[model samples]
Target: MDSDTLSGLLENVAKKFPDRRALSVSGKFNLTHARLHDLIERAASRLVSDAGIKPGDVVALTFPNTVEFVIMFLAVIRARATAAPLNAAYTAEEFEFYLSDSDSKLLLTSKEGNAPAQEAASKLKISHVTATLLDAGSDLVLSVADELVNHPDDGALFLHTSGTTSRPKGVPLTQLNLASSVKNIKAVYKLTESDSTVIVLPLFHVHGLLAGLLSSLGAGAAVTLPAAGRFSATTFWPDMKKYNATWYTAVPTIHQIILDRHASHPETEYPKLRFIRSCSASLAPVILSRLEEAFGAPVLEAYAMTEATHLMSSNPLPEEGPHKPGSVGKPVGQEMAILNEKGEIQEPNNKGEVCIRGPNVTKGYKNNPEANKAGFEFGWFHTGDIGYFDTDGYLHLVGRIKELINRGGEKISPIEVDAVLLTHPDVSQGVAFGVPDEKYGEEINCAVIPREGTTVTEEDIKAFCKKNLAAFKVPKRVFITDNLPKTASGKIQRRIVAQHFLE
Candidate 1:
């Protein structure tokens, strides 16, 4: 980005698109570029003059996807302090862990229903602020404290890892890191003034923040957020059509939800979208092709991580570049490589760890030297993802290195099973895991969420898989369910699924 920091990017937007729409919620609360600038200024002024916040200070925020989220997220950073956004869905224990671990000075939440975060903050003795709308939702501001001097290196955004496997680690992202990421996302999507996106992902995640919101705004485009603070299928279509939304970004679950309910809303009645973006989790190619055929738009699946600020690579729009169904596309912003255990780069089609190095990469894990040493090697951050590049230079993810299943002597990628199962007509979502087996040490198991009206039996799934996969790779047991355990960011937890089957 031309701007070094988030605040400067906001300023640039105001100058370039002063009269254009900057933000809106269900078309009720709207802000042009100039109006957005005023609110951010007032919000930042209130945080500094009224609340005593300074630059470099950390502010913990617990809010849903409401306008209050955007207001405070901007004001906190605008005032020169770093913003730590949290999931409102977290329990008190989860809230306490994040609050104490980040060492935040204050906690900001909505006016009501923040007992968990409020209690967590009180226990930590961190000052807290509540958001109350003085005018309408668009004018929402905190009945707020506190920013200090703008520095490029001052922490700009703080987020915790999803903690699917272990305890969540604090990731401190700098302005430079996020700015670079936003620029890359915009370039890949070819965002412009005419583009408007309806965000379906939550604000707490980097995918929703950078890929869905900030990148569009950074490109001088308008953003429409759900007024109700969450994505509701009942209102999703009306809002998309209402905003004349050209594109929308979501996780695979949300996309599947829409496809599952396709009968209720005919595709012919609505306008074809510019594209449907998928990120934060893997997009099964089976589902990917269905989404495109149903929506009459390409499915651009992107690979992202919180440590990278958001997007590392994405499949470009059909008109922009080649569209790969399973591949996550080439790197949009930085150097990417597949590295072996000996730390040497691997050749094409050779499976190894995916690593990245760029301005977008986080400096290091907060307050953890041991983690920092292991996470960074040879000047590249180990992404912990196992994957290889195809002959066409497209990155294809096989699985998380830690999540690879060991069935006796042979290694199996859970993603391989997942992809094969997803090809089944009745299966809507699937995850492969390993459970204890006295002989094999661990045996493969699968949990699948079938289509609502479809019934899938364990024997049927096993027979289908055994026909295609080797005997050892076929799942020993198949658990059918209506739902799967998910992280706050909506990622299915493979370890949790395995434990569920074990118990």
Candidate 2:
């Protein structure tokens, strides 16, 4: 395989499959590969010539998942400018921190995202460009010509660390990093021109950008974007049918929600679905089984993070590899190692930090020496996640080392608690964490989603835990919620869940 930059990949695909439909936005706008290439060129030109954007400058995008994001992302990359995608729902203070921290020179936003961007722009003295999803005219077409300068080796995208521990850190991804990810994903998934993907994840995340958008485009497959606002279960299936989608990807929670919503629809049919993929977080065994039985397709669960440009490991397609439940499958396009605290390689079944070394991984965190030192030791990116490979050579994530809860001198894994609770008849979903305590230093807490109309009490849950766990690992408190607060990609926000119960 030859290594090339993201810009080169785009140019190559455009040259090879000019007439293939590259992207479709909620069934409204569809662009062919050639059209997308030309559009990126025009958009890149407009950003530089008309908007005074220069190479190496950071452009913050505060828009939802839309066609405009795809266009602007490629445009920014073509100019060798960094595209920093921010959550549109962020508060003004959050927006200000991201904008000023990145030292972004310009902001791209829609009307709905305007208020937050405008507020941050004023405070930071950054320029703003307002683009709409519905408005596509000659003026917008002409705007692209002005932004056409190129600086290929500079930073192309700026992704923030997940910020699970401290403040989010900026990760500068070069054009080569994106290209490597796209190549890896395309090779692993076996994407082709005949394939079509239904994109439900938010565009701001690396998962959605690289795996959902760029991979599909790179392989000459079509991408169906979701409608405006948020993801709706009511409209989701209908849209899937409307697009004749063959494959799609989502986090485990999204798949669970779909399964729950369609439980009553006995005749629910998706004849076109070839496979459903899950990533960004762990997938429960129960949910994976239910999804396969309901959709009549394999649910391929993969392990990924932003620092790797998205995918690090994936369960191969049904025809190629075995589907081992609870394993994230083997590493793809990367070298995986289980390292002990002393940086020594651990034996199978000996849990340790999962470290990866590959071309797909980032060089290091941008300007954060401490993080760089901790994360990139001896040329390997330490994932901070604790996992072990089984005898069968499949990787199983135990839990995040940082997320482990301590009660007195005992260490408890919240993931283990969640796994046990999910196996209970009454539990639909749950998250377990540690809450501060005066006597114990930290106490175990859980937030659970019960099966519809099935009531579960704290004592009953404790009893269940007693059967499955030690006394110290049993939860000290439990809270039932109709739904857990999640990121746009559907991973449970553990800190938020814990805060609700702790307060």
Candidate 3:
């Protein structure tokens, strides 16, 4: 376990179940565990001699969600280089920032895709290489240098933070960190050789990479990647059924879209599906309830971030016990606690900043001492999330402490208002944020997306808010939008939304 590598994990799984199905991109690349292992070896050997890559050297990759992304990611690690995967949706400016910050020795992109990354590489004067599938396919085409270097167990994957309030900081998670987190997922979900996971999340983010892909493979289970390179609401269940998928993990946005397009689909019930795991964002309970009723499986909501190696907590599977709706569940692999301003870990039932400590937690941020100092306190990584434990030890998150709405010093939690607003029969999705006000430094404002074919007006929503919430929590203004501003992982972007409305 200590000497874990992505390639090593794949090798072990393939050796244990050589003929077992390892990866399948619906209507596209499909391979057995043994085949995946062979391809990774060929790709790694190719990179070892031709590309001049050595262990610990950072190799940046930008590719859409495809079988190539998986092969290249594992190939880079097998070649003993740190894999830095960037979002395929990043613009040239975004690519320039991440590429320049990573100090990568080489950049890999599709021979034809990711034009912005290609353009950024040329603009930055960085040596770049093109990758493609070999004639047999699944063996990604990229190479580095002659001698194979001995890679360390640490820092196999590197990425940047979301940069919500400040410049994104570098995050490097070791192979040990990733392996431990996947072990936890396998334990939480009780994964086995019989299980198959359907992955709809993007390959770049921690949620999709570690939780969705690596965890399943680490457990010697099968994985289904979408052939279209991204999620298609129409084909979600069809793909799931085709592969006999046992479960899946996604953010709330994907779940909502699936619900919207669930009709006109498969009529037969799927018995293999164990549960639906949602993470990387807060899910309104209303949607979760509706999802469970429609899908006929428990929708497990989990909590994670890149710094924690993706998973912090998750609701237990049905075999273990019942799951709570609003809570993110007890810590899955990490030790959980709460910290106040003075950096003291609080007892249960006390609301404060959520903190986690365990082998899965990263040591600190890369090259950011200030953040490392401020973020890691009391020997725990402060998650910057405001949450508390119930008497039953279930973790419940109220809001992000930084996102609290303060109207003339009257602090308000928009999450509470949003929850109440979602209770409206006609309302489907509600987002509440603070906006600039001449009178108060920040006043409450909200935007909501009505359910399809529902004509819930602004006044109707306001009337519901007034009936359910206190005056300070009520939004002074309301705007009806089709959807909220969200990041790729589907977390609501409050600051961006605030800026959009205020400006």
Candidate 4:
């Protein structure tokens, strides 16, 4: 297959399905292919003509999951400019760091987020634009002249590193990188016009933007966004039914929440789903099986990261091939291998760092020579995650190198606690981390978000942990919070949670 620019792929899809419903939000608002393309063109023109954005210019966009995010994202690329998507929940200090790191000239946001944008603009001394996605009054609309401009391969997108180690680094992905990822997903999943996706993940994250939205649109599949407020079983199921959604992707906790709700009700069955996909973190086998039983659909687990443009390996769909329960599956469009500390390839099942080399992977971190040297050794992008393939060629993620918590002399994996807590019937969402302790150097502490109507006591949780885990691994203390702090991408901010608890 020939690789094409992202704009070229969208233009092709627009021509192929001009009248088809391309995107829908809450099953109420729908955008046809023609309308989506037109909006993108006009939005691009507005940026170039009115905002004086030139090709190769970097624009930081911190917007929520909406139709406008999609339109403006495409518009940025269409204008041959680089789109740098940042989390909407970032504080002014964090936003300043990202803006300065990316050297962004313009920041695009909405009225609701204008204060933070203004605050960040003051700190960084940059131009800021606030407009509504639903408003027709915004000047960022395109005309015929804008369509004449062609996109060059130089246009790109920038995503920040997950920051497992040190501060987050900026990764610049060219149009070629975006196109490769979308194409790889389309081919690997066999996505077609019949496949529809529910978009609950945040748009700024690579998993949400590339795999969730762009890949579905590239395959001529319908994409639907959730309504305002957070996800609940009541809202999620209704939206799925309303959209007749066949597939949806989410973090492991999301699937676990839905599974718990279904188990409680016992009468509800998710009949519209063809399959459920989980990524971002490791999915425990227990939760995976429960989700399959409750949803009556296969759960396709994947291993991905921002550097690889979201997808590296995924369990094959049921019709195509068999899936191993614990494996992340083989590389879809990239070559994956286990490498020892010295950067030499290790034998299968030999524990080492996971490394990948492919078009989907970023060339290197933007302008960080030291990071580039450590992250990209030889030719492969070294994923800090430790893992190895089994004899059956199934990839297993052991744990993150930086996140392994040290308690006294023992090293504990936070994911172990996260997975175990979800298995408890009363625990809805929880995060585990090691806190400073004068006696042991560090002690395990857990913060939990209880199931909707159920209240679990600290003793109840400690007792449950004692039954399931070893003495040393059990949490020394437990704190119940109304809600745990999370990243804009829906990942639990364990470090912050632990810090706040200690304070």
**TM, every model:** 0.95, 0.93, 0.94, 0.87
lDDT of 4: 0.80
The candidates, ranked best first by lDDT, are 1, 2, 3, 4
lDDT of 3 by residue, 1-503 (tens): 22245556667788888888888889866678888888877877777678777778888998877677788788888787888999888899988889889878788887776788878988988778877765554356653332443333646788888887789999987777777788888889888778897789888888999888988888778889887778888778888988988899999888878877764464476555788999887777887898888889899999999999899998898788778878898898779887788877778888889999987888888999999998886568989899889887888887888888889988788777877877798776778898878898999888888987879778888898899888778898888878676777777787777777777
Q: Write the per-residue lDDT of candidate 1 for residues 168-270, one digit (tens) a residue.
A: 7889998888788888988898888788888788888898898788888787788888878888777787888888788999898888878876756764576
Order the candidates by TM-score, highest first: 1, 3, 2, 4
lDDT, candidate 4, 441-500, per-residue tens: 878899988877888999899999888898888998899988876666667777788888
Best by lDDT: 1
On the 0 to 100 scale, the lDDT of residue 229 in model 4 is 26
Query: Which of 1 and 4 is the better model by TM-score?
Result: 1
How many clashing pairs per prediction, in order? 11, 11, 11, 2
Scored by CA lDDT, what does every candidate get?
Answer: 0.84, 0.82, 0.81, 0.80
Which one wins on TM-score? Answer: 1
Error of 3 at 84 (Å): 1.1
Candidate 1: residue 200 lDDT (0-100): 82
lDDT of 2 by residue, 114-137 (tens): 686689888888877865544434
In candidate 1, position 338 carries an lDDT of 95
Given candidate 3, what's the lDDT at residue 224?
A: 91
